[model samples]
Target: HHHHHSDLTDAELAADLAADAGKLLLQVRAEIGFDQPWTLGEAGDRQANSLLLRRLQAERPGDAVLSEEAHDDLARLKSDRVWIIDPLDGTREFSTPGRDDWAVHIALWRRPEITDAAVALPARGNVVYRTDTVTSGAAPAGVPGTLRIAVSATRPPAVLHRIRQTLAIQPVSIGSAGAKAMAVIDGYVDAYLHAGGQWEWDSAAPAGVMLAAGMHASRLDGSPLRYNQLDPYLPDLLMCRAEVAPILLGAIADAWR
Candidate 1:
């Protein structure tokens, strides 16, 4: 079935799919309301996942897919091209009324690395950041002299205490990896550090967008972030402006030491 969208580039497709999925999530939230948060979150996840899967299947019939909401299909490991997605990144925040930090992640992995991606912050004025449109430049600087780091709103990592010992850091609480990473991109924060644990889907799209935007994205230990692995449990990530990478990585290393 040759859809009209088949003509779009991978980046365009990722952005389109993510934005569409975000719209669906918003609709689901409005219709169901936040009275039953569990049910609302479930419906948002299901509906968004379904829409993304269907669209990817139709748009790129040959590419394999790895989705947070779908069953892990090891068969995708053999495919050269894979679509990694998190239909709803922060189900908790999405379910909570008036929370806009939740996001939709869509990314394309081709052999060596992720080639295209998009992170759609729907509730935040339906904004979508795509890899193709990313300009090559340093991430916008945040407040002068203040080291602002984005952490999970609910559970800030223990390492932050250690990092704070070396640098006078300001903790900016936010929901979802995509949202936190985008905060750095948007100059709201200087960096984003997460150690609790996450999957490939959690960082794939954010990494793709961050890298394209000329931000530094890697493991908390300063290693490269690899995707499309057999084990999707990619535990930790650190995204920040290039200039602040050494300082952040050093602080993290000191914390571990």
Candidate 2:
């Protein structure tokens, strides 16, 4: 992503911090372990998410929160400003492939709007992300690419086959939906597609990013995703480069049902 602009908005500033946190995780990825019995993933996630989450939450304490590692209560539904986060999105991948698919996801929501911005940090690789809000497929500062895409490791629908049948697809294997969404915004991938188990904390952070990077994000069903509902499931999500989503959605409609 680009450097923080002096005139960056709150959302922009938040993204910058998220990026910074992402960089730090890249360093920690080389050191942290999940072998301490009970302290396994929770301790890591609590420590990791808290490091970034506290500062972010402090930046917007008025905002309620729901996090995968953090406790979720009815409180989040009460506040208009909400932060949804997953400190370590791809635990399984991190524990195994240890590739770019392992990442962190941070998302912001205010009132009627769900996520205003989000960031994805793939600690195993050099790719990090901030929301791409422009809605144009233009490259940020030094990046260059017409389109990029990150797909899920769990499930790949036949619709994706149609996608690859057309575009010059560069498939990046990943573990989390949020990280995938973030990759889409950074132009690391043109789109992110998945069809399987995922929750709200999985996608909210990166969903905003597709828009911030001027991309369009939605679900395989071509339905919109909303946050702070009584339930926490995001189901299946689709994050695409610019507006090159209808064709994919059409395929999903024709074949993925």
Candidate 3:
């Protein structure tokens, strides 16, 4: 899986960066050797942010950036290309030893159009997915005895009550939006839907990769996910297998009604 520079696409560049960043975080986390969760989380976030900002600034100089760990530079609004990043998602999960649910997110948002994105599951052994990647074969033939839907382990939103009852889904507690979304893409879960929480930094890269994999991703009401807005707040997120979208969205609509 090597691509010459002449043939590399924007998505590929994002994937490369995500992979590198994920590895760096792993190295930093181990080297810190601090048993304290807060200290380790902070160290990992800072180190990853430093690596990412420096590289992005040098490589994509003209592009604006909106990073979770960095100050919000309003200048990004004026640029057509903006990179939305979460250097280390699931800080708590990352601090916990033997946790693989955390991920690294990097995404490019082009005005009125998408640019590229990548989500790297470093603890999952260099697992990285990009917007250019595609999935093959029909998803596991039929429904199982129980349908699993990944949600925040710590903060499972109250909004899920209706959806859970409506779909009769079994809730699977997980860490990181990227890991939750990728669970659906990997057939580990049936879907990942959230309401009333999450900023742009939480979903950009995961949504990009999901869409590129021929899955479905959008707001709860089937609206498109937009980025680089003055407000980074997002009301909801819906990502799942292509066929499950209508059912989930319909249930969500009915629940709201």
Candidate 4:
């Protein structure tokens, strides 16, 4: 499909970075060749995030940057647009031989009034974008399933009981928030929610995909999650199918961390 991206609206710009970030992740992951919990290849023995962040920044310096790998750029306060990034999310999974859940995320954020919307590019090859018309990595044709929850295959307690307490769907642990969001895009699940912890880059790319796919991305409060704020850390995240969220969130309110 031809996407006419002109002037690279912040959302469009994010999509481009996410595409490259995803590519870089694959390249680096192959290069390192480490097992999970190692964080780097046996020979490389170094995190790929800092290296990737440096390159992304050098590629786009005039833009303000907030990266998980590098020190916070106080300068983010001055720019009309700031790029939020997680150079390598799920670093633990990257080194693990069989895991492809980690991803490099890049997002361009602007003021709430000016920013049209957000996007999420999950590690598993999917683009979840938010526009009047949504699109992403999930199957466009649709599928059959219980609509599983992509929780931490590593850590399950946080979201599982809360989600299951409200409903009976089984828990499915998946790598990368972006990957999980893509599940929503494809309708593999009716909704997706995350608590415990996640930062800007973790959610940004995938956020866009679900938005375009017509899913809701926000905090538990139902208020839109704003970026480029004084504190960029997010304690929890939520994305739900328009119809399922209201009822489910109400049932699991206490579980939000």
Winning candidate number (TM-score): 1
Worst 10 residues of 4 by lDDT: 113-122
* CA RMSD of each candidate after superposition: 2.6, 5.5, 2.6, 4.9
Per-residue lDDT of 66 in model 2? 79
Q: What digit string (tens of lDDT, one per residue) describes model 1 on residues 1-257?
A: 56445378899999999999999999999999999999999999999999999999898999999999999878789999999999999999999999999999999999889899999999998899999897656555556666988888456678888888779889888988889999988888889998878999989999999999888999989999998888998878899998899988998888876
In model 2, the clashing pairs are 132-212, 132-213, 133-212, 133-213, 135-214, 148-189, 148-190, 149-189, 149-190
Q: Which candidate leads the pack in lDDT?
A: 1
Q: Could you tell me every candidate's TM-score relative to the true structure?
A: 0.94, 0.75, 0.92, 0.75
lDDT of 4 by residue, 32-80 (tens): 5554345463222134455545654666567787777667858888888
Worst 10 residues of 2 by lDDT: 139-148
Residue 128, model 4: lDDT of 34
The runs of at least 3 residues in candidate 2 whose Cα sits more than 4 Å from the true structure, single-residue gaps closed, are 1-9, 33-43, 96-98, 122-128, 132-135, 139-149, 155-172, 186-188
Determine the C-alpha RMSD for candidate 4 after optimal superposition of all C-alphas.
Answer: 4.9
Better of 1 and 2 by TM-score: 1
| Model 2 C-alpha lDDT versus the unseen true structure | 0.65
lDDT of 1 at 256: 74
Which regions in candidate 3 have their CA more than 4 angstroms from the true location?
1-8, 136-138, 141-146, 153-155
Give per-residue lDDT, candidate 3, residue 129. 82
